[PDB]
Amino acid sequence: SDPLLSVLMWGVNHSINELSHVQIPVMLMPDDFKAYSKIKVDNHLFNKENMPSHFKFKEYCPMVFRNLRERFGIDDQDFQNSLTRSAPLPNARFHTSYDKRYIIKTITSEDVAEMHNILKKYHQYIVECHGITLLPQFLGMYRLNVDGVEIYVIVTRNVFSHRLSVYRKYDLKGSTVAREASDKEKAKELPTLKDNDFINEGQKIYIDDNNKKVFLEKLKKDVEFLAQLKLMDYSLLVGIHDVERAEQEGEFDPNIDVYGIKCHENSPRKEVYFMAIIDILTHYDAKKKAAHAATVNPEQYSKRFLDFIGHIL
Amino acid sequence: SDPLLSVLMWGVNHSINELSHVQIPVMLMPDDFKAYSKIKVDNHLFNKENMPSHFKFKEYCPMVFRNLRERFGIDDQDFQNSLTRSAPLPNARFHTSYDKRYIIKTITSEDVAEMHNILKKYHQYIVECHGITLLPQFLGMYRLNVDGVEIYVIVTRNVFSHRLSVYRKYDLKGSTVAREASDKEKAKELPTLKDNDFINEGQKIYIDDNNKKVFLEKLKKDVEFLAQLKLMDYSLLVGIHDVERAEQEGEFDPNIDVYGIKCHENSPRKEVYFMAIIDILTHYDAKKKAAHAATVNPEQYSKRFLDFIGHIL
Ligand SMILES: Nc1ncnc2c1ncn2[C@@H]1O[C@H](COP(=O)(O)OP(=O)(O)NP(=O)(O)O)[C@@H](O)[C@H]1O
Ligand SMILES: Nc1ncnc2c1ncn2[C@@H]1O[C@H](COP(=O)(O)OP(=O)(O)NP(=O)(O)O)[C@@H](O)[C@H]1O
Ligand SMILES: [Mn+2]
Ligand SMILES: [Mn+2]
Ligand SMILES: [Mn+2]
Ligand SMILES: [Mn+2]
Secondary structure (H helix, E strand, O other): OOHHHHHHHHHHHHHHHHHHOOOOOOOOOHHHHHOEEEEEEEEEOOOOOOOOOEEEEEEEOHHHHHHHHHHOOOOHHHHHHHHHOOOOEEOOOEEEOOOOOEEEEEEOHHHHHHHHHHHHHHHHHHHHOOOOOOOOOEEEEEEEEEOOEEEEEEEEEOOOOOOOOOOEEEEEOOOOOOOOOOHHHHOOOOOEEOHHHHHHOOOOOOOOHHHHHHHHHHHHHHHHHHHHOOEEOOEEEEEEEEHHHHHHOOOOOOOOOOOEEEOOOOOOOOEEEEEEEEOOOEEHHHHHHHHHHOOOOHHHHHHHHHHHHHHHO | OOHHHHHHHHHHHHHHHHHHOOOOOOOOOHHHHHOEEEEEEEEEOOOOOOOOOEEEEEEEOHHHHHHHHHHOOOOHHHHHHHHHOOOOEEOOOEEEOOOOOEEEEEEOHHHHHHHHHHHHHHHHHHHHOOOOOOOOOEEEEEEEEEOOEEEEEEEEEOOOOOOOOOOEEEEEOOOOOOOOOOHHHHOOOOOEEOHHHHHHOOOOOOOOHHHHHHHHHHHHHHHHHHHHOOEEOOEEEEEEEEHHHHHHOOOOOOOOOOOEEEOOOOOOOOEEEEEEEEOOOEEHHHHHHHHHHOOOOHHHHHHHHHHHHHHHO
16 A cells, blocks of 8 residues: 555565575674665556556665664564565655564665665674664665655664553753654643653662663663764663553563663562663754754763763663 | 576565555456566675676566456465475476476567557457466566576476376367478477378377367367458367376376367277467567578468367367
């Protein structure tokens, strides 16, 4: 029904099948970070029901993202199934894989240029921390062309659980400038609440001391890495699963819901938290271009961010 | 090892997989005979070991050939396996599928234009006779491009058995002009003998009266159809399996070895014959172009052919 979506599914399927025939070495070479594969399909008076008649599909750095998927505990055949067995659902357009494991976000060519710019350092950071990080997990990046329409997509891991539902959702930046959800926003079903809502509504996260220390430790290293790359406008995405409210209408596989953290035993309510960094691809200069056409530097953003999060936990 | 061969395997695999998702109706529409699918692949700094980095694959009239394959008793998944599980072996270049079921012949763009010209009438002839014919069975036609090299291929059914070996092979035209294998030819392992060899060496085909009548009946209708289309230079390909000689170093599946005919009970030797028409795509005018650059019309060729074959049986 959405032809760009069908091209995406077809393309991911194609990409994973091609890779299944490649010998995967333990290491990446420098050219792997400059690599791509392009397919251009032209059907004349054929197969009109399933696909657009004319489309292109490009995959950036196939070997790097295959390496990353395995590092993030993701098997290629599973990834293929999640994205192609049934269509992704809509919810920058966002889609969620049918099994809720992956997020598919539509991005700009500028974002793509920035992903390329950091991809090597990102990969090496992922190696150093053995894949244990709150950073977005970049799993695939593609360019889709359907009859004059060109779009770029990136695939990442869902911060939230593929099983346990989230009834409350926050997007935190820790800005000295006031951030708040608008009144039209709060009227949404699962609204994206922000820094002021959290500060004002006295939201508490009830996790024990060991879980808190571990989390903030990860968070520190991740955010420094981001600062170092002059990246900003990223958030801590926080999801709360209410085990009680879920029974009205509660444990997780930590190898799938990798961001889950159980509340401690004295929590007023049975809760599971899902917390991770999102939206890192805006470079300082790219934010300035959107502030010109339509104090707050990378390092400051970094400090404000860690201050706020250290406070809210 | 042969990059054109790898593209062919990759392309057939791709084509059959795409078709597996198409709804196949009982009928073909006129546009199906003008249809094609094209794929162009560009790999930059990727997948260098398995495929050329730049290639194109085109399939002519995918729906027609899918229809023909089923009419000829061939399942698409089996066809795919036969052509892609292991490489075709060489033997106009000819290859044989690894399981000896199919012949893959390299043809000219002129041949391709002629196949398109007759494809509708051919299909309708195949419908009328319910697939019971000595004509070549056209199963797929493709264009391959690998770095400046463009080639066209047609896939047909092997005349000979996929199991039982052939120790003697004839190529008969029935020309009033003398046809003979040369002395350098007879020195080949499995030589392609011709009209004079057969007449001179008193070769006999020992088949009973019912088998002979049925065969010549089919042959008559097939050759008239060919004459009608002004086609010529085609042969009766005759293969002889010696059951005795085969035991030194004998029955067949008639649903796979569709051209097999057992000898009668009084045959001097246990023999199985494999006989069918081959090489039909030379149009009268196309033969004249190769007679100019480097009596014998279509109807005469037709008469000479049926006279000779009626004589040899
Ligand atoms: N990895 C993820 N898992 C689950 N939900 C996500 C994820 N990424 C984004 N979302 C949801 O999508 C919303 C917007 O994500 P984001 O990537 O910040 O979009 P954006 O268009 O870049 N917004 P902006 O901050 O204006 O640039 C978030 O608040 C989440 O509700
Ligand atoms: N369908 C088939 N099954 C088995 N063997 C075949 C088949 N088609 C061709 N061959 C073999 O390949 C040889 C040449 O086939 P043919 O298609 O006549 O080639 P060609 O290059 O068109 N020859 P020409 O007659 O000079 O145009 C035959 O004599 C057979 O030995
Ligand atoms: Mn954001
Ligand atoms: Mn953003
Ligand atoms: Mn011939
Ligand atoms: Mn020929």
